[model samples]
Target: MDYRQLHRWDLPPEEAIKVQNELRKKIKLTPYEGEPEYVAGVDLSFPGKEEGLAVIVVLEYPSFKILEVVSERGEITFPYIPGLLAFREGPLFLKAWEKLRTKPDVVVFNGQGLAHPRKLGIASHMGLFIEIPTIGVAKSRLYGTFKMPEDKRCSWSYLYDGEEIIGCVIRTKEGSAPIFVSPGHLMDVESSKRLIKAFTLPGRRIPEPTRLAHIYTQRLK
Candidate 1:
């Protein structure tokens, strides 16, 4: 993949914030051109004070069969900021992604997307670099207000920050806590929901690729 470097990862907190604000403006929320045959999920885990692990898993879409897996561990170079998680973890992810043998049509990240204070969560930030369609699937809210969806599979409600709909609170499994689904880049809200629903396996709250990515990251040393 031809990933681009918009700014240095070792930027100061204030400079990182400015970069996010500028990049968020370039985020394209337009609908994607075609359906993806392959999809990938990305996640991060910190095992030590200054060390972090990053994982990316690619799977055949809808089938949920694994295609490729890549992981890398490295020293942490940036401090963790509330809304600037990409700067801290982005470099490590890029390192892992560079080892991928296959490119996915879309990428799902285990973090917020448009459902962020500046509308530039990890998924959105990385999408700009990879230039691929991306989605954000967060376990909890980072921003926005929303009523709980009904306790049934596929139930969802718009997550709003004031007047703007930032994402969706979706119940992927009945009687389970919902996940926040949002468009990252090169995608719209409806498409984000549709892809997530298709990838969500029965009796599981998270999509298969992301759940597998989470498990893979945990096992990384």
Candidate 2:
């Protein structure tokens, strides 16, 4: 998998924001009007400073059954820059994608999507790169602000970036912490939320693929 290196730090602050805005416009979001055959979850763990490991697990979509899990390690040449997380983890993620025997229909990322300062979070970056339907299922916020919901698992409000609404602040469990969700690429805000709910477990805060991917990646690390 080939990665296009980004010189985010080299640019001035204004240019960096411009770059992010351009990335937002470059991303193509589609509606999820149909059923997906497979869904994959991706996670990364950087135990060592120099190298990071990535684990990707593909499941039968809606069935919640794991089909395959793949792991790979790569050099961490990029620094830990906020909004530039794709640079730090994207390489190993692409490697994991190549190792998959059956490509997933949609990817569920354990990170942000377009709900980022750049309008391009980890999930959006990965989804656009791979040309697949992807959704962000992050545990916390990378940017933006919102009012917390009373229900732990309700996605009733939209997160706005100026006038544009990027993602939703979704409550996954009755009393659990809410997750920020957005369309990665080839998906829309509403469908992103719906798919997340459909794939979510009753008591879990995250989607099954993301939850399993987290466990699988941690073991690999």
Candidate 3:
């Protein structure tokens, strides 16, 4: 997949926030209404004190058939800062992404999107780099407030930052904690929630591709 070089990665915190402020305006929260044939998940792991790992798992949509799995490892050049994980791991994901033989129709990122203080979490941050639609499926909330969704499959409510609805707190399976979801790029709240439900399985807490990617990342670590 081709990527956009929006800006340099090596920057001070102030400059990074400046970039976020600038790029957040470019994020498009439109609906990706087409049915996808293939879907991919992205996940990151810390394999060592100074190393980071990124994994991408591609699957046949609806069927959940695994097609390709790619991984990339590199030095942890960026420091661990809240809301700036994309800089630390985005390049690695792009590296793994470039090696994929089967490119996915859509991507589900294991991080936040519009539901961030700057409204540009890892998923949304990387969305600009990717040409296709992307969604953010985070395990926890980053920047929003809302009533908890029911503890049942597909139950969800809006996540608000002040008056703006940033994302949703959704429960994909019964007896599992809710996960946060938001539009990364070329996606909107309703469609983002819809695709996430389509990508998950019965009794699964997260989308199948992301779940598989997480399991594989642990093995790589």
Models, CA RMSD each = 1.2, 2.9, 1.2
The per-model lDDT (C-alpha) reads 0.89, 0.81, 0.87
lDDT of 1 by residue, 41-151 (tens): 998888887899999999997678899999999999888777888988899999998898888999999888899999999999999999899999999999999999999
Total colliding residue pairs, candidate 1? 0
Off by over 4 Å in 2: 1-21
Q: Is candidate 2 or candidate 3 better by TM-score?
A: 3
Q: TM-score per candidate, in order? A: 0.96, 0.88, 0.96
How much does candidate 3 score in TM-score?
Answer: 0.96
**Candidate 2 TM-score versus the reference:** 0.88
Put down candidate 3 lDDT per residue, 148-210, tens digits, no spaces: 998867889999988898889888878888999998987888888889988888788889989
